[PDB]
Structures are given as structure tokens and as C-alpha cells.
Paper text:
Herpes simplex virus 1 (HSV-1) [name] is the signature prototype of the family, and it is composed of 512 amino acids. The C-terminal globular domain found in [name] has homologs in all herpesviruses, hence has been termed the [name] Homology Domain (IHD), whereas the primary sequences in the unstructured regions are poorly conserved. One major function of [name] is modulating the expression of viral genes at a post-transcriptional level. The protein functions by interacting with RNA via the RGG box in the N-terminal region and also binding to cellular proteins to promote the export of intronless viral mRNA via the TAP/NXF1 pathway.
Author numbering:
A (entry chain A): 242 to 299, 303 to 512
B (entry chain B): 242 to 512
The structure:
């Protein structure tokens, strides 16, 4: 019969023996210490780089904003910085992974666009797509973030479109399944993340839906953000579910209104 | 061959034709307006309820210290809130929808607290021999705290679970077997996955066995606060058995989330 074994039950209760405010502050202190100088004195070289501000171990969207034209011109420089500094890149990748997994909804949308715009730029210049660089390497993080936030909404929305469920889209990972902006974002990110996870040497352009001799003309920078905000707004015109309208609305307008009832902690 | 069809490419490119700063302000306005009075005329009745503060469309952010209860207080006052949930299905569905959104956007410490809130609530129901109902706002949003914690801890747990000789995160949440529980991490994810599964299957009431509790038993193995205390602990101690620098970095940044590095640009050509 399936059950929690006796010894494990003791392990779980024994948590109380080592739980205390003091112990918590000491444990936090050790993690805080790690975050003080994570690059350990081997940051990205920033000499003569236009990306120096974001290469340092020192984020405001508007402050770090670039036009597409600027990304085309200076993109290769950042690409070369990533490729030429493996230790810093692994550091950066680890940190970026955590950032993307805790970003709010608007921030997550921007990270999705940062990812695809970065791929668009590489394809524009006929550069290989490098799974090991910090941006492509953390595709799964923004995918996971967006899936967690949008899953309830997409359960209804994707049904209205007559499309596969979110889980199905992300497991099938077929270009042929893309029929709207939601399926585009999740299928492409899922395809990209899957290639990264398998540890391929480089990522085929077809992964991004780009054929031989073509470029990523069907994606414009900002489309993830603009597109997903729009359907969160417009789906209510075709849907009679109040629960759905609340869900869509609260994603777009996140200030807390209701839903927490108590905090109970007997241990510290 | 596998390709993005031409019709869909038209749809995708047309996003630009409608994208504008104004349009975004208008859309945000419509969502903000819904959130002005989400219970829309049918709030929880709160007369002579000790839970009145958290039953209204509150005016400001949830305060963990103000809304703190001892286990003894939860046992005493729990049945009242339970009765309010069960007695007001329309208000409860509204509450459940909002809580689901909250839990899916909470930060790591908040997520831990919501896991304990969920399990302590279950333990209180079991204490009183009350049915576990999927329509209950707290039980009903189990999947939300599950998804959030999984998103945040997945890279850490890949290494940690392997060191403990346990199943992977995905396997744990797929198999959903009590026999796979051998530590706090597997406990939290297996139990939440089991509970979330019963919720989505729309059962009348959820068997206590779902939470690993047999006939007449009281969930002795769970102490309120164990999710938060336990998971904070392993994020601290795993580095002692693991030689990986980047794993230590991952664990530390989860515990200490202020931004340091990792974002490179913002590019939006549409608005
Ligand atoms: Zn809907
Ligand atoms: Zn490790």
C-alpha cells in the first residue's frame, strides 16, 4: 500500500529542531555573500564595448532600450563578447536564469522579445545560434514563467481558437500547430528550449521557423508583448465566462485585491 | 513539410497595424476597471466574522504579520471561514479566480507561505473531520503554488534530487506516489501534485489519503511552516555536498533575489 514511510515522517518533523530566526538569518547571510561578487573577479571584458553598462556586475527597460537598427549594428559585438568569455558566460547564464524565473508578467514578455529579437539578429547576420550564450541558454526560464502565469487563461482561450492545449503545444513542438500569437510564442520558445536542453552544437534556423536562405521576417521585435497583451484584452469580447474575464484582467492589472487569508508558521 | 502556414504569418505581421501606446493604455484601463469591484455586488458576507478583514475586497497589500495566526487560532477559527466559503459559491468562485492569479505571481518567500497556508488549511480540515472540497478557494488553487514553486526551483532541484538519489521533479509530479517522498522537496511537490490532481478531476470531495492521511489519522508528519523552513534549509545546506560553483550561485540567488546581472536590452519596434 502506498504510504509515507515511518523514517521520512520523522525527517519531516525534525525540521522543527533546526528552524529558528537566527538560523534563518545566518543561512540568508551565506547566500547574500555569494551574490556580492558572483563573477569572482572574472567579469565580461568591457573595454571599448557599447554594451559596457550591461556587461558589468552592476535594470530599467527604458534605460537599456535599443532600436532594431541599433541591435543590428551592435549585436555582433555582444555576440563576440559572449563567445569569447566562457567563465563569465556560465556565470551570467546562471544569474539570468534566476532573474527570468522571478520576473513579473510585463518583464517576462520583454524577456521573450529579447530572446527572439536576439535570434532574429543572429539570423540577419547569418551567425550560428549558440545554445551556450546567456540569452538563448535561458529560453526555458522565460517559457516556464509565461506558462505559469498564462495557463489558466490559455485553457479557455486556446479552446475558443480550436487549438491544442498548452501542454500539447509544448510537447508536440510543431510549426504546423502555430495558428495565432499564443501558439507562436509557446511553440517557438518550446522548440528553442528543447534544442538547448539536448545540448546540440548549434541550433538549426528551422527551429525558429526559418527556411533555407530566409530570414525571420514573420517576427517583429515587440510582437510577444504587443500580441499577448492584446488577446488578454480582446478575448472577453467572445467569452461569457466571468472567471475568465477576472483572470485576464488581473494578469494585466496585478495590484493585490483579494485571495490571501492567513500566515501560519509554528516553527519560527 | 513542417512550417508556419501563410495565413498565420499574415496574422502575426498584422499585430503591428494595431499596436500603439494609446491602445495599450485603453486596454489596461479596461482590466483595471474590472479589478475595481471584482465581487461585483456579491461579496462574502462578513458580519460577526473574525475573518472580515480578509473577506472584503481589501484596500491594500496582504500583511503577513497582521494576518498571522497560531495553529491554535487556525483550529479555533478555521471552521468559520470554511462555512463562509461553502455557503457562498458565487463569491467563492470569484475569490478562487483572484487567488489563482496572486499565487502565480508571488515571489519565492510568498510562494512558500502559500504552500504552508494550503497544507495548514488541509490539516485544520482533517482535524475537524471536514470535507476537502475542490471549490474551496484555498484548496482550489493548489496548482498555482505548485506551478510557481516548480518554475522557481526547477534548476536547483535538478542537481539536488540527483544527489539524494530521488526521482526528478517532472517524474515526482507525474507519478504522484507517497512512496517517492523521502525528503522535504519530494514531500512538497508530491503532495501538492496529488492534491492539484484531485482538484482538476472535479471530485465531490478529496480523500484524506490524497495528503497521505489514513483513516482516523491527523497528518502528524506535517507541522505548519515546514514548507518554508524546510526548503529554505536545503537551499542553504546542499552546497556542502555539491562541488558545483554555478549550483551554489543558483541557490543563493533564489534566496537573495535582488537584480545584479542578466538583462542586456529592451527592443520593441511596435509601441
Ligand atoms: Zn475565456
Ligand atoms: Zn548542486
Amino acid at each position: 500500500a502506498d504510504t509515507i514511510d515511518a523514517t521520512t515522517r520523522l525527517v519531516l518533523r525534525s525540521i522543527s529542531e533546526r528552524a529558528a530566526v537566527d538560523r534563518i538569518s545566518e543561512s540568508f547571510g551565506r547566500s547574500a555573500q555569494v551574490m556580492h561578487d558572483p563573477f569572482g573577479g572574472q567579469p565580461f571584458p568591457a573595454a571599448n564595448s557599447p554594451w559596457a553598462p550591461v556587461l558589468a556586475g552592476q535594470f530599467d527597460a527604458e534605460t537599456r532600450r535599443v532600436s532594431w537598427e541599433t541591435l543590428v549594428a551592435h549585436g555582433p559585438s555582444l555576440y563576440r563578447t559572449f563567445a569569447g568569455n566562457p567563465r563569465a558566460a556560465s556565470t551570467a547564464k546562471a544569474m539570468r536564469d534566476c532573474v527570468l524565473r522571478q520576473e513579473n508578467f510585463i518583464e517576462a514578455l520583454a524577456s521573450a522579445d529579447e530572446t527572439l529579437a536576439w535570434c532574429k539578429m543572429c539570423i540577419h547576420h547569418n551567425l550560428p545560434l549558440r545554445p551556450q550564450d546567456p540569452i538563448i541558454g535561458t529560453t526555458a526560464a522565460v517559457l516556464d514563467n509565461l506558462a505559469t502565469r498564462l495557463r489558466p487563461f490559455l485553457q479557455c482561450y486556446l479552446k475558443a481558437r480550436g487549438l491544442c492545449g498548452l501542454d500539447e503545444l509544448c510537447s508536440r513542438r510543431r510549426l504546423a500547430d502555430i495558428k495565432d500569437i499564443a501558439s507562436f510564442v509557446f511553440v517557438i520558445l518550446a522548440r528553442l528550449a528543447n534544442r538547448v536542453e539536448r545540448g546540440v552544437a548549434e541550433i538549426d534556423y528551422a527551429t525558429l521557423g526559418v527556411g533555407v536562405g530566409e530570414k525571420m521576417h514573420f517576427y517583429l521585435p515587440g510582437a510577444c508583448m504587443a500580441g499577448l497583451i492584446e488577446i488578454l484584452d480582446t478575448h472577453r469580447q467572445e467569452c461569457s465566462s466571468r472567471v475568465c474575464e477576472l483572470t485576464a484582467s488581473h494578469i494585466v492589472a496585478p495590484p493585490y485585491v483579494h485571495g490571501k487569508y492567513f500566515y501560519c508558521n509554528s516553527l519560527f
